[PDB]
Amino acid sequence: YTHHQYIAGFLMVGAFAHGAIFFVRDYDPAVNTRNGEKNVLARMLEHKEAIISHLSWVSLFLGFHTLGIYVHND
Amino acid sequence: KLKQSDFPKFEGSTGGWLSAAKNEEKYVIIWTSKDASLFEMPTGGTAKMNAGNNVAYFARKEQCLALGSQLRGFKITNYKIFRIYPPLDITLLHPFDGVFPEKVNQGRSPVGKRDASIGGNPNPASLKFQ
Amino acid sequence: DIGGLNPCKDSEVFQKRLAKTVKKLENRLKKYEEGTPPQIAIQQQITQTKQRFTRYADSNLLCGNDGLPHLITDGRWSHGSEFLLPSILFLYISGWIGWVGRKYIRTVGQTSNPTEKEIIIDVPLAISIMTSGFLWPFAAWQEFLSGDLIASDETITTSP
Amino acid sequence: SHTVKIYDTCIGCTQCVRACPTDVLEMVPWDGCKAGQIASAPRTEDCVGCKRCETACPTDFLSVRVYLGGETTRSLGLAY
Amino acid sequence: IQKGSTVRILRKESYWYNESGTVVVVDQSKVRYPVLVRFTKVNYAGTNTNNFGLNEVEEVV
Amino acid sequence: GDFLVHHAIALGLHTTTLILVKGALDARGSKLMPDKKDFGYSFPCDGPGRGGTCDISAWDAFYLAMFWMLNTIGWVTFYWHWKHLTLWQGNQVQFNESSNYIMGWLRDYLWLNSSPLINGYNPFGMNSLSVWAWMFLFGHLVWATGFM
Amino acid sequence: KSTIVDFNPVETSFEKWAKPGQFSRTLAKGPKTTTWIWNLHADAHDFDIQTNSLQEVSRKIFSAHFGQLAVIFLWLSGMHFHGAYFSNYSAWLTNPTSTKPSAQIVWPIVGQEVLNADVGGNFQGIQITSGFFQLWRAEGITSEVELYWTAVGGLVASFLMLFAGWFHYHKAAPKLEWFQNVESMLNHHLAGLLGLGSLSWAGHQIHIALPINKLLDLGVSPEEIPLPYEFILNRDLIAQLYPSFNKGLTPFFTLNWGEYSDFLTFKGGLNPVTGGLWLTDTAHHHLAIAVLFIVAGHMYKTNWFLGHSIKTILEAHKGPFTGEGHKGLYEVLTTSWHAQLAINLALFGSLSIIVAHHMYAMPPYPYIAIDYPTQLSLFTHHVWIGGFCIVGGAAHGAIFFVRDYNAANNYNNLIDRVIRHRDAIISHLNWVCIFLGCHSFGLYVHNDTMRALGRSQDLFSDNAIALKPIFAQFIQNLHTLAPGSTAPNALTTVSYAFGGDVISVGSKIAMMPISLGTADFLVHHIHAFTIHVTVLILLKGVLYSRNSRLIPDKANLGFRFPCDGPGRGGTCQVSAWDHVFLGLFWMYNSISIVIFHFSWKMQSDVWGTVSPTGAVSHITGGNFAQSSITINGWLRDFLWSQAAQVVQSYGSSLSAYGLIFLGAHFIWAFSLMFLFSGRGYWQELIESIVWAHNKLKVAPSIQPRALSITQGRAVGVAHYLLGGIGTTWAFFLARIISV
Ligand code: CLA
Ligand code: CLA
Ligand code: CLA
Ligand code: CLA
Ligand code: CLA
Ligand SMILES: CC1=C(/C=C/C(C)=C/C=C/C(C)=C/C=C/C=C(C)/C=C/C=C(C)/C=C/C2=C(C)CCCC2(C)C)C(C)(C)CCC1
Ligand SMILES: CC1=C(/C=C/C(C)=C/C=C/C(C)=C/C=C/C=C(C)/C=C/C=C(C)/C=C/C2=C(C)CCCC2(C)C)C(C)(C)CCC1
Ligand SMILES: CC1=C(C/C=C(\C)CCC[C@H](C)CCC[C@H](C)CCCC(C)C)C(=O)c2ccccc2C1=O
Ligand code: SF4
Ligand code: SF4
């Protein structure tokens, strides 16, 4: 179980790292855009601030309250 | 006491040049001073200028330029930096056209100038396999 | 009952916990003398422990196999005083705080020195705004309707 | 050696040239700004990559850009 | 646009992109970026002003 | 205890996803570096200018998210191993009671079950678990060299 | 129009209180980003950049010293007030060996009243490990009324120091020439402060502490002991305990000082009743110290044709190997506050560590050697303070080199010659550090791998390859033979740690010969190695603070800067501040190892109980000798074994120690976020958070910026130190209070 979960975490981090690499060196905005309008992938860079802000909110929410309940029990 | 009479009155520091500035390249800075002012070496400690011709050798261009920038505080401006290859291959470096790089001089052509802002740079995906 | 739990009023392990805590407190009480402040403090501890256990027993609280009150937060109003009512209370208080902060930011944002009024608070205006947050649910659903709650495209965006 | 590029947003304020520790940048005549001068990078072989040049740039997103590349004993700042 | 006018920055690589600034002076010479705009928010370098081109600023009504 | 540890797992997943998604989307540029795509996926920084640009590349986002992945997998594996140690030993009441607070974890999982491991070799003898104690100390040493 | 002070220099006004950052030229314009807030506190006490005049900096420093002394006096007044009102000091006086000192009671809220422990004497509260009860007993304080009056005096003194600071900044500020009278200052601090303080304390001991403590040790209850003033008005209450006061001061003025041998003794060892040093020995010590310091205060020429000039002394100490010698050092130390701070802080931390050693080595207070929590806490606290102060001295030496160092004024002197060969110093210190670390730690690892491989005869142990600290054992033998041979007027060795008998008070060991074997050899060399590496980091920071081969103009970047850029392969942390940051880390490492060695060695081979027949049983049982030679031994028999009390403290009166244990772990792990990450990621995340705020029209006018690189490092190191030191604090306190 430990081996497979560690391999799983490694693979997930690698998937996201290679997505970032694709953004840096393989992504072409012209291909993902037709007459100003952007396709499903190019639109992920338009509300990127919304995505990051809501990920930050969820992380802060869960961390604050999980740690709060754990420390309350402590 | 010293090899040359124009050397600054420096007692020598274990921060000077090494075997690199005997087989790759060494840098020499020359300047003329009105007073035997006491200045700080870019490598070690305090040295004394000569009331006249002064010549110093360093291992890096940056060390010579730091010394020259210090010299400007002494109202010294005529300092000139040269690059010496393993043999006596002297090349004037810092006052390249006799005018400091901060002052515009005619006869200089723009090198590395792009006729657009940063936003005009090409997309990296279009610069693949060249 | 819910999730296999049982009421704490009929949980034997709950009463065992109460008895053990009281016994420990009384054993501690035995090593002091007369009506001295230490004995008074330990007696107050015993009384508070008994009161807390009695209140938890008579509180519609479900206890597990460890004799500890478990919270039923699936949403049912039967156990509504465990999560739902505190949830509403916190939502009210936190919305109050956020609303008064946002109102103060937007109010001193239209003055000559907006940054000065953030390290040196305008206490009169701050007090004026803070006591006005009791209507934050109504104020929020009166500014969202007028379009004054959300910016549209003056917000800045990165290069891609 | 590192690569240094100058962009026409240059206002010719000379702060990049007087901040270079290795005499890489210089001011050259130009007609695209009020000062009539633009920075140039004719001695990038001495560029060390310290990026003091673009720390002194007042233009919005820079007019001098340093792209780190192949390393050399001059660019690595090796006194040995 | 003129001195005191309010413009929106259209330059993408700008700390004030999509934001509004105040025009300090529009140069009448043949410079590439004549419009000088002053902003209330300092950028990451601490400056609060920048020169923009004529096609990189849009006047606010 | 399962509820709380599942929420901890959710927090770990969300934070690792936040770091990785932020690095992926901000890979092509941001306000601090609107030309980050011109510098590639992995570069050290953009210099001390503009307030400081440490760990600004997309590679640095991977680098930071590796710690959070390790932490999240550690939480998951700690939860699994403690639950199954209590299940196999029979004292499932130990987990159900002590897993709700942090000191319960520290005392009853780590401190409690580390006793056989550290006594893989003592000033009196050694066991077949001696290699595991050596690997324990080796892992601590490599961890702290990473800290270096 | 006095020649030493300026009258009414600064007006007492509240106007500048309402203008934050008024001191700084850059911060006075007001905040534009959140970096301004952090810069406000980082430059508050940097008086060098607030004024261009040394006089103004000196006056600010003088008033800040007064404020600090007022704070210290308030803290002492609080301690005495707690002893008077919220303590069991009276009960502890009647039963020092069975009552645990407590001077802080906890209010009954949120169930926290469990922290009120059973300290004894019909009292509930937190056990005190600062040793105030023993100090007060040594002072002769036998009533809580005296503690109350000392607290009142402390409050009055704190107000007086506050008024003095205000007066000397706003009403009469001294001039630069007054501050630069280092000869007069040294004369006064040596004679008046030190010598007259020792003399006054010797007088107090002789007239108050000597009789009261002698009566206390005789079994007289504190209620029937006469009030301290009665020992002065009546020469018969003190002449019964010490039958030499009957002669008055005539033996003193007639040079017949032998008559005062009743209360001015030279005994050594410890009092068998209390386990502390003989208070007669302490009084004689303070008298001798007073005379020596008063004599030493008449050395420097101040206002007459008499004494020394420090300038003439330094300038005469040249040599063939040192060029101009100490010429210019007087100008350095009279024109730079940072150099004085460097010297004073380094020697002050070293003095604190020496104090920590001599404390447990020779317990100076009654019933303090048998209070193991007090001894452990005092040692650890003083060693921590010493390490911090030493790192601060190194930091301010680097600051002086960056800011106040003048190359022209230091031509060919000691400072110049040190910089001229900094390479040699740093390279040889690097080699020494590698040698010491390789050896000490690799001997530890060799022991660990030999034990793991089942080869017990290949270890670096006593029953194996043995590394006997023969030099230290020789010194131990020399001290135990000193009374009667080299100290012929001594009756007992200075400390029983060097050898002698086991001293026990109430069946608890006070002091005992500390045997040194191969285990002490390894840990002592570990101490030497860690100290050498810390010195390496700090000395590299000081010497390379102005220039280097990387950055020939590092002095132009200041003392505190993050880098010079990603060029030259990367120029992170080249500052001198970034060396005080790494040196802080290594000081934490060294001091942690030192306190671990002390705790384990004392618990295993000094502390314990003595059976009525004379059998010594220790707290752990002598496991230090054989199990402190491997890292697995330290992990298991010390950390894992003695952490049992901390983890099992829940539900007991020590539960606060477990909570602080967990919280310190949390803070230490929190530090690694700042230590491992970088500013760009956090700035770009704040970008999206700011986008959300702007979308909801709640973006603050003060633009939020991620902490600067230097501030990120400072936050990381501060959190790391707090977490580690707090974890060790909770561990030590819970372990040593439980057992
Ligand atoms: C099948 C999966 C797969 C594939 C095909 C690739 C392929 C690639 N990756 Mg990638 N990656 C993967 C999984 C994968 N990765 C995962 C799972 C992660 C997350 C950890 C990453 C994270 C990652 C990053 C962050 C980067 C790449 C990069 C690259 C490219 C260059 C690789 C390189 O230079 O290697 C270099 C190989 C090494 C440096 C060897 C490292 C060996 C490590 C340290 C382990 C060795 C220690 C070993 C355990 C010793 C034991 C100790 C003992 C005491 C017990 C290449 C296209 C790079 C790139 O530029 O892409 C364009 C880049 O920057 N990848
Ligand atoms: C008081 C005004 C205020 C308001 C209305 C908001 C509103 C918001 N913040 Mg926010 N924030 C504030 C202050 C405020 N914040 C401050 C002072 C900080 C610095 C610690 C932050 C740091 C912060 C982060 C890091 C994040 C948010 C996020 C968010 C959004 C989701 C809610 C959330 O996660 O709460 C977050 C709330 C906190 C972390 C605690 C705030 C600290 C106190 C309680 C607020 C200050 C009170 C103030 C002093 C009152 C003075 C007013 C008075 C003078 C009249 C939402 C737009 C998240 C987001 O973007 O999601 C979309 C997110 O990731 N905020
Ligand atoms: C015998 C005379 C004498 C005495 C006792 C002291 C004592 C002290 N001086 Mg001092 N000083 C003296 C002469 C003296 N000085 C002279 C002649 C000069 C001129 C060169 C200075 C210049 C000087 C400076 C520049 C500084 C000191 C500081 C200090 C303090 C060091 C902190 C310490 O050890 O805490 C021990 C603390 C105590 C024992 C508390 C009780 C001490 C009280 C306040 C008695 C102080 C005696 C005072 C000089 C009497 C003047 C009264 C006034 C009405 C005239 C200490 C209180 C430093 C300090 O902390 O500043 C405040 C500091 O920065 N002194
Ligand atoms: C006699 C002691 C003494 C004195 C007078 C000074 C004085 C000075 N130091 Mg200094 N220093 C000292 C000891 C001292 N230091 C020690 C022991 C160290 C080693 C750690 C240092 C390390 C140091 C560095 C690295 C730097 C200074 C700097 C400075 C200057 C500016 C200080 C400032 O504005 O801070 C204002 C005060 C603060 C910012 C307070 C910060 C809060 C601290 C860090 C946390 C304390 C936590 C506390 C223990 C409570 C935690 C409990 C928790 C549960 C809450 C000033 C001349 C700086 C400078 O530029 O010098 C010219 C600088 O860069 N010092
Ligand atoms: C456990 C983690 C760890 C370890 C092992 C070290 C080790 C060391 N640090 Mg440190 N350091 C650490 C954490 C650690 N650090 C952290 C967390 C920080 C952050 C603040 C630092 C910051 C720091 C600074 C700032 C400095 C050091 C320095 C040193 C060196 C001192 C000289 C020495 O003893 O070398 C000897 C090496 C050892 C003792 C390591 C073990 C070697 C074994 C026992 C012997 C040889 C084994 C053999 C060769 C194996 C061969 C087989 C193999 C090929 C398979 C040494 C390499 C100093 C330095 O550069 O050196 C002078 C220095 O200036 N460190
Ligand atoms: C409950 C249930 C169910 C359902 C289930 C489901 C529906 C699931 C789903 C799941 C899912 C749905 C999952 C997902 C996941 C995802 C992920 C994991 C992702 C990741 C991503 C990434 C990694 C990305 C990457 C990238 C980038 C970053 C950009 C560029 C491109 C790419 C793509 C590369 C059923 C009915 C069957 C039955 C049982 C019950
Ligand atoms: C505890 C404490 C306190 C208190 C303190 C005190 C109480 C002190 C005292 C002190 C004192 C009370 C001191 C005294 C001193 C004195 C002296 C120091 C004297 C001297 C004298 C002399 C020196 C003389 C000499 C001579 C002459 C000149 C002539 C004749 C001969 C002869 C020789 C005799 C307080 C509250 C603050 C705070 C807290 C802590
Ligand atoms: C998280 C983080 C930030 C962001 C951190 C910020 C913006 C600090 C925010 C502090 C808040 C706003 C105030 C403090 C709030 C605390 C609750 C108060 C402290 C607790 C008291 C008990 C002392 C950096 O700027 C940074 C820079 C360089 C390296 C690493 C990092 C880094 O890890
Ligand atoms: S890096 Fe920037 S500063 Fe250093 S040389 Fe090249 S250009 Fe001049
Ligand atoms: S930012 Fe971090 S890495 Fe980039 S230069 Fe400054 S310090 Fe070196």
Short mmCIF file of N, CA and C in Angstrom, two decimals, chain B residues 16-21 24-25 27 59-63 65-66 72 83 85 93-97 100-119 121, chain D residues 3-9 14 17-19 21-30 36-43 45-46 48 52 61-63 65 67 73-74 76-80:
data_model
loop_
_atom_site.label_atom_id
_atom_site.label_comp_id
_atom_site.label_asym_id
_atom_site.label_seq_id
_atom_site.Cartn_x
_atom_site.Cartn_y
_atom_site.Cartn_z
N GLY B 16 44.61 38.02 -4.40
CA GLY B 16 44.97 38.44 -5.74
C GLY B 16 44.69 37.36 -6.75
N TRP B 17 45.35 37.47 -7.90
CA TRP B 17 45.09 36.51 -8.96
C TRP B 17 45.76 35.18 -8.66
N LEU B 18 45.34 34.16 -9.42
CA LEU B 18 45.79 32.79 -9.22
C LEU B 18 46.36 32.26 -10.53
N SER B 19 46.55 30.94 -10.62
CA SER B 19 47.12 30.35 -11.82
C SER B 19 46.30 30.66 -13.07
N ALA B 20 45.02 31.02 -12.91
CA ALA B 20 44.20 31.37 -14.06
C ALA B 20 44.74 32.61 -14.77
N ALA B 21 45.13 33.63 -14.01
CA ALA B 21 45.69 34.83 -14.63
C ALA B 21 47.19 34.69 -14.85
N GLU B 24 45.26 31.99 -18.86
CA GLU B 24 44.01 32.31 -19.54
C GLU B 24 43.89 33.80 -19.86
N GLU B 25 43.93 34.67 -18.86
CA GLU B 25 43.85 36.11 -19.06
C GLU B 25 44.04 36.86 -17.75
N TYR B 27 43.90 41.12 -16.11
CA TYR B 27 43.41 42.47 -16.36
C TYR B 27 44.26 43.47 -15.60
N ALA B 59 42.53 39.67 -11.60
CA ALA B 59 42.14 38.45 -12.30
C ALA B 59 40.82 38.57 -13.04
N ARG B 60 40.02 39.59 -12.74
CA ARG B 60 38.71 39.75 -13.35
C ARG B 60 38.52 41.18 -13.84
N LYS B 61 37.71 41.33 -14.89
CA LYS B 61 37.32 42.66 -15.33
C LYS B 61 36.48 43.37 -14.28
N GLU B 62 35.65 42.61 -13.55
CA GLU B 62 34.80 43.21 -12.53
C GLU B 62 35.63 43.81 -11.40
N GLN B 63 36.74 43.17 -11.03
CA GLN B 63 37.60 43.72 -9.99
C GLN B 63 38.20 45.05 -10.42
N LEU B 65 36.98 47.09 -12.65
CA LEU B 65 35.92 48.09 -12.75
C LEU B 65 35.45 48.54 -11.38
N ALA B 66 35.44 47.65 -10.38
CA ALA B 66 35.13 48.07 -9.02
C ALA B 66 36.19 49.04 -8.49
N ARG B 72 36.58 56.97 -8.84
CA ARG B 72 35.75 58.13 -9.14
C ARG B 72 35.45 58.94 -7.88
N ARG B 83 42.86 44.17 -21.03
CA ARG B 83 42.88 42.72 -20.91
C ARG B 83 44.16 42.19 -21.51
N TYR B 85 46.14 38.70 -22.45
CA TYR B 85 46.06 37.26 -22.68
C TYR B 85 47.34 36.62 -22.14
N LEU B 93 39.86 47.94 -22.82
CA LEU B 93 38.51 47.46 -22.58
C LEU B 93 37.54 48.56 -22.15
N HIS B 94 37.81 49.24 -21.04
CA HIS B 94 36.73 50.02 -20.43
C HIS B 94 36.49 51.33 -21.17
N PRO B 95 37.47 52.24 -21.29
CA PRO B 95 37.17 53.42 -22.13
C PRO B 95 37.37 53.07 -23.60
N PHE B 96 36.41 52.29 -24.13
CA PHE B 96 36.60 51.64 -25.42
C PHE B 96 36.81 52.66 -26.54
N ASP B 97 36.00 53.72 -26.56
CA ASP B 97 36.16 54.80 -27.52
C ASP B 97 36.66 56.08 -26.86
N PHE B 100 33.32 57.32 -21.55
CA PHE B 100 32.70 56.34 -20.67
C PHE B 100 31.37 55.88 -21.27
N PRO B 101 30.99 54.62 -21.05
CA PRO B 101 29.77 54.09 -21.69
C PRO B 101 28.50 54.82 -21.29
N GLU B 102 28.50 55.52 -20.15
CA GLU B 102 27.31 56.24 -19.72
C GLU B 102 27.05 57.50 -20.52
N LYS B 103 28.06 58.03 -21.21
CA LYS B 103 27.93 59.23 -22.02
C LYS B 103 27.84 58.83 -23.49
N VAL B 104 26.87 59.40 -24.20
CA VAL B 104 26.67 59.06 -25.60
C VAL B 104 27.81 59.61 -26.43
N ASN B 105 28.38 58.76 -27.28
CA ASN B 105 29.43 59.15 -28.20
C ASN B 105 29.03 58.75 -29.61
N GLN B 106 29.28 59.65 -30.56
CA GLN B 106 29.04 59.33 -31.96
C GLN B 106 29.99 58.23 -32.41
N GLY B 107 29.53 57.42 -33.36
CA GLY B 107 30.30 56.29 -33.83
C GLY B 107 29.96 54.97 -33.16
N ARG B 108 28.95 54.93 -32.30
CA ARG B 108 28.51 53.71 -31.66
C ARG B 108 27.23 53.23 -32.34
N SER B 109 27.18 51.94 -32.67
CA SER B 109 25.99 51.37 -33.26
C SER B 109 25.24 50.53 -32.23
N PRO B 110 23.91 50.51 -32.28
CA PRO B 110 23.14 49.72 -31.31
C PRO B 110 23.35 48.23 -31.53
N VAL B 111 23.68 47.52 -30.46
CA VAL B 111 23.89 46.08 -30.48
C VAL B 111 22.86 45.44 -29.56
N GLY B 112 22.13 44.46 -30.09
CA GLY B 112 21.11 43.80 -29.31
C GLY B 112 19.84 44.60 -29.12
N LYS B 113 19.48 45.43 -30.09
CA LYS B 113 18.28 46.25 -30.01
C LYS B 113 17.15 45.59 -30.80
N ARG B 114 16.00 45.45 -30.15
CA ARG B 114 14.80 44.93 -30.79
C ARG B 114 13.80 46.07 -30.97
N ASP B 115 13.23 46.17 -32.16
CA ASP B 115 12.31 47.27 -32.48
C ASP B 115 10.88 46.94 -32.07
N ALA B 116 10.71 46.53 -30.82
CA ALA B 116 9.41 46.21 -30.24
C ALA B 116 9.60 46.08 -28.73
N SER B 117 8.49 46.06 -28.01
CA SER B 117 8.52 45.90 -26.57
C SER B 117 8.64 44.41 -26.23
N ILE B 118 8.53 44.07 -24.95
CA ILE B 118 8.62 42.68 -24.53
C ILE B 118 7.47 41.87 -25.10
N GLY B 119 6.28 42.47 -25.18
CA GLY B 119 5.10 41.74 -25.62
C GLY B 119 5.16 41.25 -27.05
N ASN B 121 7.60 39.53 -28.37
CA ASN B 121 8.48 38.38 -28.52
C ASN B 121 7.69 37.19 -29.08
N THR D 3 22.82 36.43 -22.91
CA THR D 3 22.26 37.25 -23.97
C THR D 3 21.54 38.44 -23.35
N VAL D 4 21.85 39.64 -23.85
CA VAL D 4 21.24 40.88 -23.37
C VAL D 4 20.60 41.57 -24.57
N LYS D 5 19.31 41.86 -24.45
CA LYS D 5 18.56 42.53 -25.50
C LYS D 5 18.01 43.85 -25.00
N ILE D 6 17.97 44.83 -25.89
CA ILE D 6 17.43 46.16 -25.60
C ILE D 6 16.18 46.36 -26.44
N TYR D 7 15.15 46.93 -25.83
CA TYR D 7 13.86 47.11 -26.47
C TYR D 7 13.55 48.59 -26.60
N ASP D 8 12.77 48.95 -27.62
CA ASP D 8 12.55 50.35 -27.96
C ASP D 8 11.76 51.11 -26.90
N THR D 9 11.33 50.45 -25.82
CA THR D 9 10.75 51.15 -24.68
C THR D 9 11.80 51.93 -23.90
N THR D 14 20.04 55.99 -18.78
CA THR D 14 21.43 55.58 -18.52
C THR D 14 21.61 54.80 -17.23
N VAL D 17 23.40 51.39 -17.75
CA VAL D 17 24.82 51.41 -18.11
C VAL D 17 25.68 51.68 -16.88
N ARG D 18 25.27 52.63 -16.05
CA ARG D 18 26.05 52.97 -14.86
C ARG D 18 25.85 51.99 -13.72
N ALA D 19 25.05 50.94 -13.92
CA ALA D 19 24.90 49.88 -12.94
C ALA D 19 25.59 48.58 -13.33
N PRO D 21 28.33 46.02 -13.65
CA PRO D 21 29.63 45.88 -12.99
C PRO D 21 30.76 45.43 -13.90
N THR D 22 30.47 45.01 -15.13
CA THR D 22 31.48 44.45 -16.02
C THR D 22 31.58 45.19 -17.35
N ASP D 23 30.99 46.39 -17.44
CA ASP D 23 31.05 47.22 -18.64
C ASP D 23 30.56 46.44 -19.86
N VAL D 24 29.29 46.06 -19.81
CA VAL D 24 28.64 45.38 -20.91
C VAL D 24 27.76 46.33 -21.71
N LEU D 25 27.06 47.23 -21.03
CA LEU D 25 26.13 48.14 -21.67
C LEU D 25 26.78 49.50 -21.90
N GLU D 26 26.31 50.18 -22.95
CA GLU D 26 26.77 51.52 -23.27
C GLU D 26 25.62 52.27 -23.93
N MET D 27 25.71 53.60 -23.90
CA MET D 27 24.68 54.46 -24.46
C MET D 27 25.07 54.88 -25.86
N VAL D 28 24.15 54.70 -26.81
CA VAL D 28 24.42 54.99 -28.21
C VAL D 28 23.34 55.94 -28.72
N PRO D 29 23.64 56.71 -29.77
CA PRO D 29 22.65 57.66 -30.29
C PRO D 29 21.41 56.95 -30.81
N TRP D 30 20.28 57.64 -30.69
CA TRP D 30 18.99 57.09 -31.10
C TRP D 30 18.05 58.26 -31.36
N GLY D 36 17.22 60.98 -26.90
CA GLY D 36 18.01 60.74 -28.09
C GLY D 36 19.09 59.70 -27.93
N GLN D 37 18.93 58.80 -26.96
CA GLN D 37 19.92 57.78 -26.66
C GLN D 37 19.22 56.47 -26.34
N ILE D 38 19.89 55.36 -26.63
CA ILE D 38 19.38 54.04 -26.30
C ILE D 38 20.54 53.19 -25.81
N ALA D 39 20.24 52.29 -24.87
CA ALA D 39 21.25 51.38 -24.37
C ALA D 39 21.62 50.35 -25.43
N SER D 40 22.87 49.92 -25.40
CA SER D 40 23.37 48.88 -26.29
C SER D 40 24.15 47.87 -25.47
N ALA D 41 24.28 46.66 -26.01
CA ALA D 41 24.99 45.57 -25.34
C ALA D 41 26.03 45.00 -26.29
N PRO D 42 27.12 45.73 -26.53
CA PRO D 42 28.15 45.26 -27.47
C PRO D 42 29.21 44.36 -26.86
N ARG D 43 29.21 44.17 -25.54
CA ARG D 43 30.24 43.40 -24.86
C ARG D 43 29.61 42.34 -23.96
N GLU D 45 30.08 39.31 -23.95
CA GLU D 45 31.03 38.30 -23.52
C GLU D 45 31.49 38.53 -22.08
N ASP D 46 31.41 39.77 -21.60
CA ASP D 46 31.71 40.09 -20.21
C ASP D 46 30.48 40.06 -19.32
N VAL D 48 27.90 38.98 -16.80
CA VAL D 48 27.97 38.00 -15.73
C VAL D 48 26.60 37.47 -15.33
N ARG D 52 21.90 43.44 -12.44
CA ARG D 52 21.84 44.80 -11.92
C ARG D 52 21.31 45.76 -12.97
N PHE D 61 7.69 47.13 -18.04
CA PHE D 61 8.36 45.84 -17.96
C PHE D 61 9.70 45.87 -18.66
N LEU D 62 10.62 46.70 -18.17
CA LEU D 62 12.02 46.63 -18.58
C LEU D 62 12.24 47.02 -20.04
N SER D 63 13.40 47.59 -20.32
CA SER D 63 13.86 47.75 -21.69
C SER D 63 15.15 47.00 -21.96
N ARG D 65 16.82 43.27 -21.14
CA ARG D 65 16.46 41.93 -20.69
C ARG D 65 17.68 41.03 -20.79
N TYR D 67 19.01 37.23 -20.71
CA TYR D 67 18.65 35.82 -20.85
C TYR D 67 19.90 35.00 -20.57
N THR D 73 34.09 31.17 -18.04
CA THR D 73 34.84 31.62 -16.87
C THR D 73 34.64 33.10 -16.61
N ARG D 74 34.37 33.89 -17.66
CA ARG D 74 34.02 35.29 -17.46
C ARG D 74 32.60 35.44 -16.94
N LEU D 76 30.85 33.17 -15.33
CA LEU D 76 30.72 32.54 -14.02
C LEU D 76 31.39 33.35 -12.91
N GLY D 77 32.06 34.44 -13.25
CA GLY D 77 32.74 35.24 -12.25
C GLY D 77 33.84 34.50 -11.53
N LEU D 78 34.63 33.71 -12.26
CA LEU D 78 35.68 32.89 -11.67
C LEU D 78 36.99 33.67 -11.69
N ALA D 79 37.49 34.03 -10.51
CA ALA D 79 38.82 34.60 -10.39
C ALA D 79 39.91 33.54 -10.46
N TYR D 80 39.54 32.27 -10.47
CA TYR D 80 40.49 31.17 -10.56
C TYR D 80 40.27 30.37 -11.84
#
